[PDB]
Design a protein around this motif. Structure first.
Motif, PDB file in Angstrom:
ATOM      1  N   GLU A   1       0.829  -1.195   0.000  1.00 46.52           N
ATOM      2  CA  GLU A   1       0.000   0.000   0.000  1.00 46.52           C
ATOM      3  C   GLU A   1       0.878   1.266   0.000  1.00 46.52           C
ATOM      4  O   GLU A   1       0.555   2.251  -0.683  1.00 46.52           O
ATOM      5  CB  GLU A   1      -0.972  -0.049   1.179  1.00 46.52           C
ATOM      6  N   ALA A   2       1.994   1.230   0.740  1.00 40.35           N
ATOM      7  CA  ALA A   2       2.927   2.375   0.782  1.00 40.35           C
ATOM      8  C   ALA A   2       3.580   2.634  -0.565  1.00 40.35           C
ATOM      9  O   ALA A   2       3.721   3.804  -1.005  1.00 40.35           O
ATOM     10  CB  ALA A   2       4.011   2.148   1.838  1.00 40.35           C
ATOM     11  N   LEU A   3       4.006   1.554  -1.231  1.00 38.77           N
ATOM     12  CA  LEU A   3       4.626   1.714  -2.567  1.00 38.77           C
ATOM     13  C   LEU A   3       3.581   2.213  -3.584  1.00 38.77           C
ATOM     14  O   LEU A   3       3.886   3.087  -4.410  1.00 38.77           O
ATOM     15  CB  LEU A   3       5.221   0.380  -3.069  1.00 38.77           C
ATOM     16  N   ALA A   4       2.347   1.700  -3.520  1.00 34.81           N
ATOM     17  CA  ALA A   4       1.327   2.171  -4.447  1.00 34.81           C
ATOM     18  C   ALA A   4       1.145   3.707  -4.281  1.00 34.81           C
ATOM     19  O   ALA A   4       1.008   4.443  -5.280  1.00 34.81           O
ATOM     20  CB  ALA A   4       0.000   1.488  -4.137  1.00 34.81           C
ATOM     21  N   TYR A   5       1.184   4.185  -3.044  1.00 29.14           N
ATOM     22  CA  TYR A   5       0.963   5.616  -2.770  1.00 29.14           C
ATOM     23  C   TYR A   5       2.154   6.427  -3.301  1.00 29.14           C
ATOM     24  O   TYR A   5       1.981   7.438  -3.996  1.00 29.14           O
ATOM     25  CB  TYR A   5       0.853   5.858  -1.246  1.00 29.14           C
TER      26      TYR A   5
ATOM     27  N   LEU B   1       9.405  -3.988 -11.246  1.00 26.99           N
ATOM     28  CA  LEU B   1       8.656  -2.756 -10.879  1.00 26.99           C
ATOM     29  C   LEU B   1       9.413  -1.527 -11.456  1.00 26.99           C
ATOM     30  O   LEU B   1       8.849  -0.751 -12.242  1.00 26.99           O
ATOM     31  CB  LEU B   1       8.530  -2.632  -9.360  1.00 26.99           C
ATOM     32  N   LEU B   2      10.697  -1.405 -11.138  1.00 26.82           N
ATOM     33  CA  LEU B   2      11.477  -0.247 -11.641  1.00 26.82           C
ATOM     34  C   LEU B   2      11.413  -0.093 -13.149  1.00 26.82           C
ATOM     35  O   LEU B   2      11.184   1.008 -13.670  1.00 26.82           O
ATOM     36  CB  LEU B   2      12.935  -0.390 -11.199  1.00 26.82           C
ATOM     37  N   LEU B   3      11.646  -1.202 -13.863  1.00 21.28           N
ATOM     38  CA  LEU B   3      11.889  -1.077 -15.313  1.00 21.28           C
ATOM     39  C   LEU B   3      10.588  -1.066 -16.148  1.00 21.28           C
ATOM     40  O   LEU B   3      10.655  -0.853 -17.372  1.00 21.28           O
ATOM     41  CB  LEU B   3      12.887  -2.173 -15.791  1.00 21.28           C
ATOM     42  N   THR B   4       9.416  -1.247 -15.483  1.00 17.33           N
ATOM     43  CA  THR B   4       8.146  -1.057 -16.249  1.00 17.33           C
ATOM     44  C   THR B   4       7.442   0.265 -15.913  1.00 17.33           C
ATOM     45  O   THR B   4       6.429   0.579 -16.539  1.00 17.33           O
ATOM     46  CB  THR B   4       7.156  -2.234 -16.047  1.00 17.33           C
ATOM     47  N   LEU B   5       7.929   1.018 -14.907  1.00 15.80           N
ATOM     48  CA  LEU B   5       7.316   2.299 -14.588  1.00 15.80           C
ATOM     49  C   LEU B   5       7.702   3.353 -15.617  1.00 15.80           C
ATOM     50  O   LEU B   5       8.767   3.287 -16.225  1.00 15.80           O
ATOM     51  CB  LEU B   5       7.800   2.770 -13.205  1.00 15.80           C
ATOM     52  N   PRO B   6       6.837   4.359 -15.809  1.00 20.70           N
ATOM     53  CA  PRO B   6       7.117   5.406 -16.787  1.00 20.70           C
ATOM     54  C   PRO B   6       8.103   6.457 -16.291  1.00 20.70           C
ATOM     55  O   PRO B   6       8.595   7.278 -17.103  1.00 20.70           O
ATOM     56  CB  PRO B   6       5.711   5.998 -17.105  1.00 20.70           C
TER      57      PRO B   6
ATOM     58  N   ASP C   1      -0.662  -7.832   0.548  1.00 23.56           N
ATOM     59  CA  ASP C   1       0.748  -7.624   0.225  1.00 23.56           C
ATOM     60  C   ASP C   1       1.048  -7.663  -1.272  1.00 23.56           C
ATOM     61  O   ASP C   1       2.234  -7.656  -1.665  1.00 23.56           O
ATOM     62  CB  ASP C   1       1.640  -8.619   0.998  1.00 23.56           C
ATOM     63  N   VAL C   2       0.003  -7.678  -2.091  1.00 24.93           N
ATOM     64  CA  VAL C   2       0.205  -7.625  -3.538  1.00 24.93           C
ATOM     65  C   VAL C   2       0.036  -6.187  -3.992  1.00 24.93           C
ATOM     66  O   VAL C   2      -1.031  -5.580  -3.838  1.00 24.93           O
ATOM     67  CB  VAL C   2      -0.762  -8.526  -4.326  1.00 24.93           C
ATOM     68  N   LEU C   3       1.112  -5.672  -4.624  1.00 28.30           N
ATOM     69  CA  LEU C   3       1.072  -4.342  -5.294  1.00 28.30           C
ATOM     70  C   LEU C   3       0.628  -4.535  -6.730  1.00 28.30           C
ATOM     71  O   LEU C   3       1.121  -5.440  -7.415  1.00 28.30           O
ATOM     72  CB  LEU C   3       2.502  -3.771  -5.278  1.00 28.30           C
ATOM     73  N   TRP C   4      -0.237  -3.663  -7.237  1.00 30.39           N
ATOM     74  CA  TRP C   4      -0.518  -3.636  -8.687  1.00 30.39           C
ATOM     75  C   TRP C   4      -0.258  -2.234  -9.255  1.00 30.39           C
ATOM     76  O   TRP C   4      -0.464  -1.205  -8.564  1.00 30.39           O
ATOM     77  CB  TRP C   4      -1.934  -4.104  -9.050  1.00 30.39           C
ATOM     78  N   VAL C   5       0.287  -2.228 -10.462  1.00 26.91           N
ATOM     79  CA  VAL C   5       0.555  -0.968 -11.185  1.00 26.91           C
ATOM     80  C   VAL C   5      -0.037  -1.120 -12.596  1.00 26.91           C
ATOM     81  O   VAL C   5       0.364  -2.029 -13.337  1.00 26.91           O
ATOM     82  CB  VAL C   5       2.080  -0.720 -11.287  1.00 26.91           C
ATOM     83  N   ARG C   6      -0.995  -0.273 -12.939  1.00 27.38           N
ATOM     84  CA  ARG C   6      -1.741  -0.447 -14.203  1.00 27.38           C
ATOM     85  C   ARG C   6      -1.451   0.722 -15.146  1.00 27.38           C
ATOM     86  O   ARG C   6      -1.464   1.885 -14.693  1.00 27.38           O
ATOM     87  CB  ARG C   6      -3.243  -0.451 -13.892  1.00 27.38           C
ATOM     88  N   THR C   7      -1.173   0.392 -16.406  1.00 24.85           N
ATOM     89  CA  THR C   7      -1.027   1.418 -17.444  1.00 24.85           C
ATOM     90  C   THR C   7      -2.118   1.192 -18.485  1.00 24.85           C
ATOM     91  O   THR C   7      -2.283   0.078 -18.953  1.00 24.85           O
ATOM     92  CB  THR C   7       0.311   1.268 -18.110  1.00 24.85           C
ATOM     93  N   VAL C   8      -2.846   2.242 -18.830  1.00 26.15           N
ATOM     94  CA  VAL C   8      -3.867   2.137 -19.889  1.00 26.15           C
ATOM     95  C   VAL C   8      -3.625   3.292 -20.870  1.00 26.15           C
ATOM     96  O   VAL C   8      -3.622   4.459 -20.463  1.00 26.15           O
ATOM     97  CB  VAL C   8      -5.267   2.250 -19.334  1.00 26.15           C
ATOM     98  N   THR C   9      -3.393   2.960 -22.133  1.00 27.66           N
ATOM     99  CA  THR C   9      -3.307   3.990 -23.210  1.00 27.66           C
ATOM    100  C   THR C   9      -4.136   3.515 -24.399  1.00 27.66           C
ATOM    101  O   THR C   9      -4.715   2.432 -24.376  1.00 27.66           O
ATOM    102  CB  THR C   9      -1.865   4.199 -23.705  1.00 27.66           C
ATOM    103  N   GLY C  10      -4.112   4.314 -25.464  1.00 23.57           N
ATOM    104  CA  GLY C  10      -4.762   3.870 -26.708  1.00 23.57           C
ATOM    105  C   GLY C  10      -4.201   2.576 -27.289  1.00 23.57           C
ATOM    106  O   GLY C  10      -4.869   1.927 -28.082  1.00 23.57           O
ATOM    107  N   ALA C  11      -2.994   2.178 -26.887  1.00 23.57           N
ATOM    108  CA  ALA C  11      -2.369   0.944 -27.362  1.00 23.57           C
ATOM    109  C   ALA C  11      -2.773  -0.334 -26.596  1.00 23.57           C
ATOM    110  O   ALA C  11      -2.455  -1.456 -27.033  1.00 23.57           O
ATOM    111  CB  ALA C  11      -0.861   1.093 -27.396  1.00 23.57           C
ATOM    112  N   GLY C  12      -3.456  -0.165 -25.468  1.00 20.71           N
ATOM    113  CA  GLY C  12      -3.846  -1.298 -24.643  1.00 20.71           C
ATOM    114  C   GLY C  12      -3.626  -1.060 -23.154  1.00 20.71           C
ATOM    115  O   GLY C  12      -3.496   0.079 -22.695  1.00 20.71           O
TER     116      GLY C  12
END
Ligand SMILES: OC[C@H]1O[C@H](O[C@H]2O[C@H](CO)[C@@H](O)[C@H](O)[C@H]2O)[C@H](O)[C@@H](O)[C@@H]1O
Ligand SMILES: OC[C@H]1O[C@H](O[C@H]2O[C@H](CO)[C@@H](O)[C@H](O)[C@H]2O)[C@H](O)[C@@H](O)[C@@H]1O
Ligand SMILES: OC[C@H]1O[C@@H](O)[C@H](O)[C@@H](O)[C@@H]1O
Ligand SMILES: [Mg+2]
Length: 580
Positions: A341-345, A415-420, A520-531
């Motif tokens: 939860e801390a990392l998501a924030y 986590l590091l290498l998929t973040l924008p 304890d599961v973090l999720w990081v979601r990306t949504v663009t016109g590409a998917g």
């Protein structure tokens, strides 16, 4: 209509003259009564021009050796372009026009396209030189990083060091190679399509080899101090120009693509135009695409939006990540809970502290500012860098700290290498290197004994002054070929390829990035016109099936990359998966 304050005609130091006429020597001194230049052993009185400016032209060319003589005292040139015999020796006259650059088809790199790879020239290879580093460029290109971040190169005293004791800011440190060896490294990087960035230290000079006060005490002020001496007085234009002229050298004359400004909170300046703004003005005047990054802990967006820097090394992400994996609470780690939860924030907000109270003992204040103005590339994130390894008593890397598994280490990479945000890796990180990165130095005499004593007292702690401490930090390249080192390296290659190729991960807008957690599961979601893509990282001690993670959207079905190479959408403890 900003006009640079620099004119090559009036450049301080030793500058070759046109038409093979020799070299123009210039200095500023506010206090000397007699002023001479000693060239190849012969003294010549210099001409007083007014304003403490002194000049002389002689028919000596590049390669000539010199220093200045102030009231009879031989004194190194603070504007030296090279110091073959170290920081107390004669300078060499250097001609930047002689090197045959082949990088005309290179045009810099945008921050949003950077994946930084932090190199310490002395430890990166056995030889510890630019020429040996250049031989690893094809490896770095194939790995998938795009910008090398070189630790400081200004000459300092002794035969090894991190670089933060640099004293002659314009002189590349001789043990690493000559000026043309540095140019060759940058040219070769550019030919492979890699950017090269330089760490520069405009908040302090090292303790040995800084002779600026010998010329004019007013380069510095007693109003505030640095770690090593009197503070740099940015109210004094010659002090401003010492660093802006240096920034322009590195970018223009050595073809660096950008600078990382060390410890920007400590570049104190109450001038109408802050020195950070003037640095940006001066580098932009060059008419290139060079970038400026700030190492700044204040969580202050004005560095980008007012000073017109490009981005900020922002440690909240690093710290939240390390605390998540180790539970440690000493020092500034006490500022973070860690966990999904801390990392998501922290990711949601870019940095955590946006004005809330920082309760760390000895440092208590309301820390930071709203991050809304900053876009994803403006934040530089990492899970390792020179300081977050070397400022630990034993210099151990993240996978080497107690309680961290290689599975957790591999999840953190995903986590590091998929973040924008703009990521940085430390040399050897990519293969879970076995060697530490310890603090080492090689100062002379009492200063050296003081360093060893200071390190012992601060925290068996490796003696920074011992040769062994330097050698223990050398990369072992051969180890990357086998075992878990090779497995980790394969994962880094796969992640860097995904970052480059995946059309959704190309996102660079915080508008398109959301985060959350289920236990304890973090999720990081990306949504663009590409998917759509979702990174799930299991920061728990148990196994979690992706199907059973509670999410406020429908999870994507296709498994794109699992950090342990599993076939099914299940996460062992510490593991991560990217789905689309
Ligand atoms: O004191 C430094 C600056 O603080 C403010 O700017 C920060 O906080 C704002 C919201 O409070 C944001 O909009 C801005 O992006 C931040 O940098 C203040 O607005 C500035 O004028 C100050 O220089
Ligand atoms: O086990 C006692 C500690 O529990 C918490 O710390 C753990 O859980 C955090 C997530 O909530 C992790 O980031 C951290 O690494 C774990 O150590 C609690 O925050 C601590 O104050 C307790 O001492
Ligand atoms: O990252 C936050 C930390 O940044 C450090 O480099 C500062 O020196 C320290 O006081 C602060 O706790
Ligand atoms: Mg739950």
């Amino acid at each position: 209509s900003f006009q640079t304050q620099h004119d090559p005609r009036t450049r301080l130091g030793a500058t070759p003259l046109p038409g093979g006429a020799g070299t123009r020597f210039r200095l500023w001194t506010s206090t000397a009564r007699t002023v001479a230049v000693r060239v190849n052993g012969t003294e010549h009185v210099m001409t007083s021009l007014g304003g403490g400016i002194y000049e002389l032209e002689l028919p000596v060319g590049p390669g000539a050796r010199y220093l200045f003589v102030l009231d009879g005292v031989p004194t190194p040139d603070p504007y030296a372009r090279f110091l073959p015999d170290g920081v107390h020796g004669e300078a060499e006259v250097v001609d930047f026009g002689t090197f045959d650059w082949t990088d005309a088809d290179w045009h810099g790199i945008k921050l949003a396209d950077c994946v930084f790879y932090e190199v310490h020239v002395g430890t990166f290879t056995p030889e510890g030189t630019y020429r040996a580093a250049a031989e690893k460029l094809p490896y770095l290109k194939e790995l998938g990083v795009t910008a090398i971040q070189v630790m400081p190169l200004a000459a300092f005293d002794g035969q090894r060091g991190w670089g933060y004791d640099g004293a002659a800011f314009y002189a590349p440190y001789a043990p690493y190679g000559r000026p043309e060896d540095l140019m060759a490294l940058v040219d070769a990087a550019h030919r492979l399509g890699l950017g090269v960035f330089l760490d520069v230290v405009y908040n302090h000079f090292g303790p040995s080899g800084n002779y600026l006060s010998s010329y004019a005490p007013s380069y510095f002020t007693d109003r505030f101090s640095s770690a090593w001496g009197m503070g740099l007085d940015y109210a004094e234009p010659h002090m401003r120009r010492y660093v802006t002229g240096n920034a322009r050298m590195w970018l223009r004359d050595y073809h660096f693509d950008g600078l990382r400004l060390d410890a920007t909170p400590y570049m104190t300046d109450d001038s109408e135009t802050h020195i950070l703004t003037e640095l940006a003005q001066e580098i932009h005047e060059l008419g290139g695409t060079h970038l400026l990054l700030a190492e700044d802990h204040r969580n202050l967006p004005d560095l980008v939006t007012v000073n017109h820097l490009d981005g900020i090394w922002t440690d909240d992400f690093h710290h939240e990540t390390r605390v998540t994996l180790t539970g440690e609470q000493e020092g500034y780690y006490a500022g973070y809970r860690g966990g999904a939860e801390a990392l998501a924030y922290t990711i949601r907000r870019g940095w955590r502290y946006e004005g809330q109270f920082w309760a760390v003992k000895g440092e208590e204040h309301e820390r930071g500012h709203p991050s809304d103005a900053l876009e994803a590339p403006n934040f530089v994130y990492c899970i390792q860098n020179h300081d977050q390894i070397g400022n630990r008593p034993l210099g151990e890397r993240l996978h080497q700290s107690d309680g961290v598994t290689l599975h957790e280490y591999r999840g953190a990479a995903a986590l590091l290498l998929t973040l924008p945000m703009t990521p940085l890796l430390f040399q050897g990180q990519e293969w879970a290197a076995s060697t530490p990165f310890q603090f080492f130095s090689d100062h002379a005499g009492e200063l050296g004994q003081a360093v060893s004593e200071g390190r012992k007292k601060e925290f068996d702690v490796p003696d920074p002054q011992a040769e062994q401490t330097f050698l223990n930090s050398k990369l072992n390249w051969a180890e990357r070929e086998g075992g878990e080192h090779a497995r980790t390296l394969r994962l880094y290659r796969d992640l860097l390829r995904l970052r480059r190729e995946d059309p959704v991960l190309h996102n660079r807008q915080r508008e398109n990035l959301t985060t959350g957690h289920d236990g304890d599961v973090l999720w990081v979601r990306t949504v663009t016109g590409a998917g759509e893509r979702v990174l799930l990282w299991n920061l728990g001690q148990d196994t979690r099936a992706v199907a059973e993670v509670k999410l406020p959207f429908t999870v994507p079905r296709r498994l794109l990359l699992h950090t342990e190479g599993r076939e099914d959408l299940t996460l062992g403890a510490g593991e991560a998966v990217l789905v689309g």
